[PDB]
Ligand binder design. Structure first.
Ligand code: HEM
Ligand SMILES: CC1(C)[C@@H]2CC[C@@]1(C)C(=O)C2
Ligand SMILES: [C-]#N
Ligand SMILES: [K+]
Ligand SMILES: [K+]
Ligand SMILES: [K+]
Length: 405
């Protein structure tokens, strides 16, 4: 279950952290990962879990490694190694310079101009969901809002039918938080196979949706191939169907549990964008990594060619060296430092869509359903993985306190 220590890895750096089932999970997932930042724990450790890999535990090291693509390559960015080796998504599995032509196309389909284009749709969807939900006095938040709000927006953006959401959500779940029904590679291939006939249909007759744009793109002075388009659309789907969905649940769980923080935003709505950034720091949720292109000494530690190193995006903003009292949510925090959207050349291009979705959710939910709580009895369970998430979030409220605008 624990893989034997490789000869080059010193024993005193061993810390057996399981990224898919961390010891302290019951305390909350961010808290569970934060054990890597207790004072005894070295800045850079090796876990024997999940095949054996390095973990950088401080924001300083995490940022530094993400800037150095020469040594820390994204060709194999997932743990376990078998998943990383099968990982061939575009642009994420590519380093500069090769990454750049494909990254331009990815940004074209999720960037700010798309957010601006979809402004009314995003607003309308949040409004419609909340209006349907508010008179009920309860919801399963993950299922009833956290999933459908960003996913319907993504399927819209992608020109894909909503009928396919359960299938696609399942497949993407398996690549970030596998339940054991599928390997990463099996889930990837299933997603690729879903997309290829759609890509083939849309290559011929080009359109406005993300899949058409990718499929009709130009890269390296030539048409993008169907297979390249497949590798990129696959990534876009993983990106569009997981991170915002799970982040919204962390944020709403917190708000459900902190009336004082709800009040701040209700009474001072101009603070919502800042609050969004602080929630992005505190409830950061992504952890992937890189692979060593050659033997390299890093912060006094001998990394060997082929070693995998987890560089948890989640940990930077929780580092007390970066943010004092890091587990405390302060919407008035002066310098919100985080790498929630990553760092280096793979810095998330979808972050503007994400922020808009978070901000619209905060504004509309908190004003229409200002007063809500976790259902009595309930204990909220988190799950850990490449993207961490909330399993279920039962909320209750008095419908009489709710607003239609
Ligand atoms: C709270 C929301 C989000 C979070 C925390 C997040 C996080 C991240 C992180 C950490 C990376 C870099 C991974 C790495 O360096 O290996 C990334 C990349 C990426 N994200 Fe997001 N993201 C969010 C929203 C979105 C959305 C809404 C989309 C829409 C499609 C999206 C699309 C992408 C794409 C295409 C990449 C790959 C960029 C590249 O490889 O050059 N993201 N994201
Ligand atoms: C780690 C990510 C968040 C980033 C975009 C989707 C994701 C799961 C990837 O495979 C790359
Ligand atoms: C990005 N997801
Ligand atoms: K050793
Ligand atoms: K790979
Ligand atoms: K998913």
């Amino acid at each position: 279950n624990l893989a034997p220590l490789p000869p080059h890895v010193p024993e005193h750096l061993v810390f057996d952290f399981d990224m898919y089932n961390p010891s302290n999970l019951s305390a909350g997932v961010q808290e569970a990962w934060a054990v890597l930042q207790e004072s005894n724990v070295p800045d850079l450790v090796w876990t024997r879990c999940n095949g054996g890999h390095w973990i950088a535990t401080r924001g300083q090291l995490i940022r530094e490694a993400y800037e150095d693509y020469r040594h820390f390559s994204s060709e194999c960015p997932f743990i376990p190694r078998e998943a990383g080796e099968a990982y061939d998504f575009i642009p994420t599995s590519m380093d500069p310079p090769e990454q750049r032509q494909f990254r331009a196309l990815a940004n074209q389909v999720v960037g700010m101009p798309v957010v601006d284009k979809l402004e009314n749709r995003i607003q309308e969807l949040a409004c419609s969901l909340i209006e349907s939900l508010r008179p009920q006095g309860q919801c399963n938040f993950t299922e009833d809002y956290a999933e459908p709000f960003p996913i319907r927006i993504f399927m819209l953006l992608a020109g894909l039918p909503e009928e396919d959401i359960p299938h696609l959500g399942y497949l993407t779940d398996q690549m970030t938080r596998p339940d054991g029904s599928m390997t990463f590679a099996e889930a990837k291939e299933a997603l690729y196979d879903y997309l290829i006939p759609i890509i083939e249909q849309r290559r011929q007759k080009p359109g406005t949706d993300a899949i058409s744009i990718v499929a009709n793109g130009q890269v390296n002075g030539r048409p993008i191939t169907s297979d390249e388009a497949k590798r990129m659309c696959g990534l876009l789907l993983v990106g569009g169907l997981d991170t915002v969905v799970n982040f919204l649940s962390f944020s709403m769980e917190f708000l459900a549990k902190s009336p004082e923080h709800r009040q701040e935003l209700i009474e001072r709505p101009e603070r919502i964008p800042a609050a969004c950034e602080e929630l992005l720091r505190r409830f950061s949720l992504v952890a992937d990594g890189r692979i060593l292109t050659s033997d390299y000494e890093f912060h006094g530690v001998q990394l060997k060619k082929g070693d995998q190193i987890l560089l948890p995006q989640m940990l930077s903003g929780l580092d007390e060296r970066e943010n004092a009292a890091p587990m405390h949510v302060d919407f008035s925090r002066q310098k919100v430092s985080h790498t929630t959207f990553g760092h280096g050349s793979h810095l998330c291009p979808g972050q503007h869509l994400a922020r808009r979705e978070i901000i619209v959710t905060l504004k509309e939910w908190l004003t229409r359903i200002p007063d809500f709580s976790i259902a009595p009895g309930a204990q909220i369970q988190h799950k850990s993985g490449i993207v961490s998430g909330v399993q279920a979030l039962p909320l209750v409220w008095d419908p009489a306190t709710t607003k239609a605008v």
